[PDB]
Design a protein around this ligand. Structure first.
Ligand SMILES: O[C@@H]1[C@@H](O)[C@@H](O)OC[C@H]1O
Lengths: 676, 682, 677
């Protein structure tokens, strides 16, 4: 057992195991461990640290200690690590269960003494290869845990839950967590694996990796934790103005004329509309990244008319490359495609045999961007819908695929970050500022590449709506402030079904108080293409209409008023977006973000704060016409729908007619005057 | 160390390793070993053995011995095994290199003493799984080794060569070997692996297996070894008479009219023709197994007219099932398809995303047969072209596929046998006798299912032709008497190119003296289909013409006379085919099969015997117009082309003009009279 | 398909596959290939290249070419590679069997066209990991192949043979090959694997690796190839004088008194003796690396007396560290030990549970050297016996062990080079020149660390003797000029058995004309130790006596004249050793090394050249009293035993009584003058 101590770095070593702890921004430490000869150069999501002035490394008895502001790490003579805040309170301690460790007998008076033989930092060698990593920490009975990204589950507090560290359609692993004990932690490792916050032990796992790497931060409030995390992995940029308006989309406007007729109908009725969207398979083949002129005769003319109307066009980008295309040939020559380890060299079979471009290859990123630049960006398109961002393998056999940066088991989760980066860096180099692209997935730090994330191809049910509320809140905690959904859900909504129409209204009303308000879906009754194939290429179907006038007049009036409300909200949304850029605060936040001293704020999972001044209580059940709403203590609250004043620190039974959900405004906040 | 002996079985055991040796037919032993609790019930290619009456099991000193006729196995107290014949000559010896084995020190006076620590029977456990098997035997300085199946290499004798135990297009692993030391050995294990007959050590390897299993046989002559092997794995059936005639094929007759135009034109020129062939993609989609009526409007009328003409139709069967078909849906419901272990559930991407039917699944065999029965056999088609029989994965990642009988790594090589079995059993059940189907691949015992094997999609060169001669002869030694090639090779022959025309003629001349005489290929210039797609299904191209009149008048005359010569040979062919059925002897044989006592017979690799009465000496180089020919001792030889008589036991410098290759007939054999060999005085 | 060409580098790429060919010494090229983003920085055995005189890179048609003196590489538009010499003759061509390659249909007129789908450079991805590599080349009909290291097999020409690329007791993978077609090739990759020189195809295989890496060289003669190889991987140093004399050893002299009594007896009988050896388990425990004072009370006094007698002491070093020792604790603290991937953390169980020191770890190398320096070298010991150099795992499950530089499957074969390096660098740093240590194993480049390799614990038979001849010759071709055996073999020789005694004499006679003349073995009847354990530590047995007088008076007379003959040869041996250092030529050479233009020189495997002036024809069978000997053309030959002159270019029946083997001297060679004076 040997310490190697300098003024700003703690290293411990035994039997080739190196544990290295150092400052990494104010109130924060980076922890690394390896049994290779040295640590490698992989920083993954962590940006260069602003130097800490206050770091102090000490030695006492058989231990060593490193303090950086409000966090300290203690490593004992057996190489066992625990973390404390500035008040000396335990934040986090490693989980050891051994009789012998670091060449020494374990202390029989400690819960660490056990014949079971579990190490806190298990680097298990893979034969012929690298390491299978498990990092174990003690559970705590009072610990509540948030963040981790976007999971399709009805839990805000994820203590007791196990989350797969993998990317699938409707899931995003963004592995930053925030604990109610007063710390946050980033698992700075893109390997396929799992995080289990089980009641008996916390275990982080990486299937294949070179080394342990995490970042831990301490502060007295969630807001400071979020700020410290944003300094570690990058700030969201400033949201462009147009992104705060209404985004109109469906699966799918099949022709230029169809899309333009919708936009013209919005303008004919003087309705708000900021963005309109051309969904997938508007292209001749996958990997062409251009409009098919048979259905889109004059894209420039579409964009120019939309510009006259004050509307931005967003276009679908698929990362797939069909093997019959010219771009497949050239990308294959250059080595810019993902590779199958075994079997046919095909990663997806949706409407063609396609291979994904490799978003971890800097050359492939540039290539795909420059195709999109030439065919779309040069025409005046400045928003891209970066769909299939996981990427969506037809079969999620992660072991069977390899990227430029290594096997998908080792590096796979960073794909969506690279995909967003390709477009953000490309658009920035082309002279665009305030970039936003619609990404289906993300990793740690995706926020710095302007990633507006949505929750994918979920079903159209109230159960799904409930999951989306939890997922969006946890995404904000994981540092992804720009987040949204398909209003009404993606799959299964019949436009003539009264039950779906009720869900649509409830989801729309919530969508007004989401970071982006976006109508999209694949509505029934669907329509098969007239021709199944054209030039041997399978043709893509469409769903039914999905405009605010498509569901009758009663529903039209409700959604029209929703759009008018969203327009009145825009200055407040831009203020909250600037705050997200400035301070790393989410836009939609759990109650504890703004009221961390109040017990109820850490319990309630069906209410949230839309910025600091608006309390939102969505209706999450069919047929519900009232619900209980807890009003936080410390201010009075103004009912958005009645103008009535209510004192903080009480439960209210609130009216929730089909035409409105309960929403309260912080008294005397600037947004109060803006909304009436 | 412990022997468990009975009157007809030797078992040795130490530390869970069981070695079991027992008689398995006359002059033959089966050898099995495992570290599992017991031996499993897998017999693979071995048929039940006829009881051997005089089997003798003894123990002496610390050793044990089992004798069965001309072969004996000796196992010493360290479990080390060697084989001897009735004259006490060493046939085959296990390779051990250890200082400590079976709980005992190794003998320092033996070549077995070595710190290296190699076992002869290495069952290396796969973590969480079964075993990786290596069976090591000592090499022997003057051992020459034949058989093993069909490999694309210019070596008849494969001592010093390493052969992959896997099935790929143009390769067939049929793992029966015959040694010049006077034994034969079947590796009775369908696992993916390798056999290396290296000069320093012989190693058989199986990637995944439950147990070691081989069959070994001893006799004084090759013919006896071949007979004993056919008794162990099954006799070839009797060939139907039409199969000895001329088979006309190309890639591809696209329509009923095109095929019938060729058939009628053969009859109009009074040319011999016994089989005509409809190649692949005559169907609406892969897995439909029926004629596409747009190109083939009345299959019944086609078959009836061909029958009036004395011609059998053969049709292409592909084992692929495209995922848009009705049979895919049903076969998926029932579990009748091969499965990918990882990635997209697609085993081949040629003209569609297809999955192979599982030829190791009894239910799937029956399902595919009954489709072919309903759509082809009930109409009067008696011959099936079982193509892609390996099967031809787009990528040969054997580790990524699984069959009914287990992972491809453990059982993969038996697929072509099951594919043959599916059609043979079905046609037999339907009342057909004398069955022959054209298979691209085979395993040990494929011969019993009427498998006429051909050597696949080789290129059209003299290099290829040389490889095919070696491959065809080794297939015969491996117990596959019915074997042929694409005359001219498959890929790359332009019909207007003199260099290819030269090759076509030499290959055709050789083809006359192959077990089946079959013209096929994908000739240039190729023609793309008019429509690349139809109903979203990719359409299949065709090559150029490939009939005997398609290469100019001078070449037409040579091929015409080749066909006429083949017809005169038919009675002899049918006698030699009967001998293959009765004795297990190959049809095309190396010289050592008929003349085992003569040294030149074990050295010469560019001559062979076509039955016992015809010596063939093919021309295997462009521009060559004469070659040396060794005539075997013990008889006189009649030159087929001149009529001259030559004494056995000499090298002759033979004329070999474009119009004929050197062929010699055994004097006074019945075939001499049948060939009508004159000698005019001008 | 894309070429990236500069003045001295050819790169070809398709689908992330990068093939890079460049000069690496005169008449030589280095070939690397990877599917990773870039080539790594691993040079393994290749030393920095001297920049070449006339390197030319050019593109023509759809191909590219790189010429460096007498070798050239051609890469076509399908990425397929072949090598030619200055006369345009094909040396080596890649084996491809595909219908489609590098995005293009294959040529149907070529032997490369095949549906089998075998690539010449197969970098097969291991799931979650690196690559399984197969490099395939066409076999050639008259190609004869030599080198590869030390294998226990009766084949000099290894065409048709398959060799394991792994290190085991009695085997050494030193993967430089020399072909009769006029090239040599180093497989510059330490991975566990295999080389298959099959008649139908040549296949090199690595179980786990990051990239393809080989070095290829061309010259008109074997001598130039050997020289070019030595420039690439390092010259053998100059051998010290004492190493050419007689090395006396057995398993084992158990005490200081017992060793010294043998040394004194050799001097008392006026017999030559240059080195005497303390074998294993002279230490308190494995990993102590010091004399046990209970059996060795005054080591400094022993060394001083041997110095007075003109004798160097060599001591056994074992790379094992027993888990009860002080050094185990410290080396485990520092991470200087080899690791088991699974199961009990024990690599060997011989007389204790031990773990090997990690010879690929620079710190571990330094640690072990400094233990040996403090306890042996500082006392005046100048030669170490680096035994168990593979290292000798109790079970050779290479997948189950890991070194500093990675899994044993990826890097394992370089261990013995590291082991030699540890002592050579330390001894050189300590002020010693002309270093020689006795290594049981080697890899490519081991020669530069003064590695005298011996063929390990082989059995005592005539079969073994035949194998050793072949192995030693092939080790020389592989660039290991300092090579020897246990005279008599290691295991199974009973000193009272007349059959063994005959083998011993024939082996000794051959031993006179080996690069080093060294007597060693574990002779029967063996003797168990007095007590099985002392202080819980299992005690090591000894074999019977193994001195030249231990086998009766008639045998003593023969071995006595062998030693005297060896002393007369020492000036010649030292000249041949200097030539090895200057030119990379081996000491014991096959006939084709000195007579490459003669057909018989490439066929004969039971004769060899001991330097350029002595033709040796050992007796390799029991009871043989005469044998056939081919005399090379171009000079006359003097029979060493009779003095009779013989013209070159003929076969002779030579008398081979028990008292001599047929040896011939090149007429008028300086060694003829030295032997007759
Ligand atoms: O939202 C959908 C997206 O997730 C994918 O399936 O492509 C079509 C879109 O409508």
């Amino acid at each position: 057992s040997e310490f190697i101590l300098t003024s700003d770095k703690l290293v411990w070593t035994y039997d080739g195991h190196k544990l290295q702890i150092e400052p990494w921004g104010e109130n924060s430490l980076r922890v690394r461990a390896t049994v290779a000869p040295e640590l490698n150069g992989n920083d993954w999501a962590l940006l260069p640290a602003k130097p800490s002035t206050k770091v102090k490394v000490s030695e006492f008895e058989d231990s060593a200690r490193i303090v950086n502001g409000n966090i300290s790490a203690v490593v004992n003579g057996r190489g066992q690590l625990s973390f404390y805040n500035q008040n000396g309170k335990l934040l986090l301690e490693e989980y050891w269960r051994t009789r012998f460790v670091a060449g020494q007998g374990e202390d029989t008076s400690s819960k660490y003494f056990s014949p079971l033989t579990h190490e806190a930092r298990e680097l298990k060698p893979i034969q012929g290869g690298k390491f299978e990593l498990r990092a174990r920490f003690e559970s705590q009975p009072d610990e509540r845990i948030y963040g981790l990204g976007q999971y399709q589950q009805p839990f805000l507090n994820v203590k007791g839950c196990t989350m797969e560290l993998a990317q699938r359609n409707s899931q995003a692993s963004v592995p930053f967590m925030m604990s109610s004990l007063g710390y946050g932690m980033l698992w700075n490792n893109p390997a396929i694996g799992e995080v289990s916050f089980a009641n008996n032990v916390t275990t982080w796992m990486a299937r294949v990796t070179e080394q342990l790497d995490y970042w831990i931060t301490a502060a007295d409030t969630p807001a400071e934790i979020s700020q410290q995390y944003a300094a570690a992995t990058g700030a969201a940029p400033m949201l462009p103005d147009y992104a705060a308006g209404f985004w109109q989309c469906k699966l799918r406007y099949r022709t230029q004329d169809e899309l333009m007729e919708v936009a013209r109908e919005y303008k004919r009725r003087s309705l708000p509309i900021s963005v309109i969207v051309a969904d997938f398979f508007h292209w001749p083949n996958q990997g062409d990244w251009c409009f098919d002129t048979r259905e889109w005769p004059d894209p420039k003319a579409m964009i120019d008319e939309l510009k006259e109307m004050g509307i931005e066009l967003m276009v679908s980008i698929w990362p797939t490359v069909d093997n019959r295309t010219e771009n497949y040939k050239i990308m294959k020559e250059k080595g810019y495609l993902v590779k199958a380890e075994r079997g046919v060299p095909v990663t997806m079979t949706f409407l063609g045999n396609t291979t994904f471009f490799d978003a971890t290859h800097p050359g492939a990123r540039k290539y795909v961007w420059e195709q999109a630049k030439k065919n779309y960006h040069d025409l005046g398109i400045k928003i891209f819908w970066l769909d299939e961002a996981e990427p969506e393998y037809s079969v999620y056999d992660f072991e069977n695929y390899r990227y430029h940066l290594g096997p998908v088991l080792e590096v796979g989760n960073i794909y969506p970050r690279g995909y967003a980066q390709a477009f953000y860096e490309g658009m920035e180099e082309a002279g665009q500022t305030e970039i936003v692209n619609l990404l289906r997935c993300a990793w740690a730090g995706s926020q710095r590449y302007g990633a507006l994330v949505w929750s994918g191809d979920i079903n159209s049910t109230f159960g799904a709506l409930r999951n989306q509320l939890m997922a969006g809140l946890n995404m904000g905690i994981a540092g992804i402030p720009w987040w949204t959904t398909d209003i009404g859900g993606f799959d299964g909504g019949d436009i003539n079904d009264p039950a779906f129409q009720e869900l649509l209204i409830r989801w729309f009303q919530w969508g007004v108080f989401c970071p982006v308000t976006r109508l999209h879906g694949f509505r029934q009754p669907m329509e098969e293409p007239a021709e199944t194939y054209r030039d041997g290429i399978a043709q893509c179907m469409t769903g039914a209409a999905n405009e605010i006038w498509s569901y009758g007049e009663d529903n039209y009036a409700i959604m029209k008023s929703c759009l008018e409300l969203r327009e009145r909200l825009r200055p407040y949304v831009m203020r909250v977006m600037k705050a997200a850029h400035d301070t790393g605060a989410p836009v939609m936040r759990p109650l504890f973000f703004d009221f961390p001293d109040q017990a109820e704020a850490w319990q309630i999972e069906d209410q949230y704060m839309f910025g600091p001044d608006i309390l939102v209580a969505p209706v999450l059940e069919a047929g519900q016409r009232s619900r209980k709403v807890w009003l936080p203590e410390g201010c009075a609250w103004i009912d958005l729908n009645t103008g009535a004043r209510q004192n903080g620190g009480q439960w209210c039974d609130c009216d929730a007619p089909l035409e409105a959900i309960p929403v309260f405004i912080r008294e005397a906040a600037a947004v109060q005057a803006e909304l009436s």
